[PDB]
Nucleic acid binder design. Structure first.
Length: 101
DNA sequence: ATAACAAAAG
DNA sequence: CTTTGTAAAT
């Protein structure tokens, strides 16, 4: 079920997916909420990667950016819908990606 | 105004 | 072995 794939090649797939989220974020820029293109979680020399998955409200207070987690579903009804990203596991280890397909 | 973590929950 | 929060680079 799981696939280990070299870095430069799967980065092409990753950058395509992140591009969809960049373009979506410009479309909803006046809704005030942020769909994070690329989220990394670190454990045990692995990086777990979640593309276009988690919504935040960004506030800037006192110079400093603040991240308010909103969730996985789009936070305002009737706003444009986020792009279909594959949900599947992405793990970076040792300049390679473990992926599902 | 997009790119290094922890712990809880799954 | 994902979900929910915390906090330089472009």
């Amino acid at each position: 079920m799981r696939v280990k794939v070299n870095e430069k090649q799967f980065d092409m797939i990753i950058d395509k997916l992140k591009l969809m989220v960049y373009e979506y974020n410009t479309k909803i820029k006046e809704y005030g909420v942020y769909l994070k293109p690329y989220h990394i979680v670190y454990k045990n020399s692995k990086r777990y990667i979640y593309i276009g998955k988690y919504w935040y409200k960004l506030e800037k207070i006192g110079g400093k950016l603040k991240w308010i987690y909103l969730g996985k579903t789009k936070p305002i009804q009737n706003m444009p819908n986020p792009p279909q990203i594959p949900e599947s596991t992405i793990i970076k280890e040792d300049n390679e990606y473990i992926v599902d397909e």
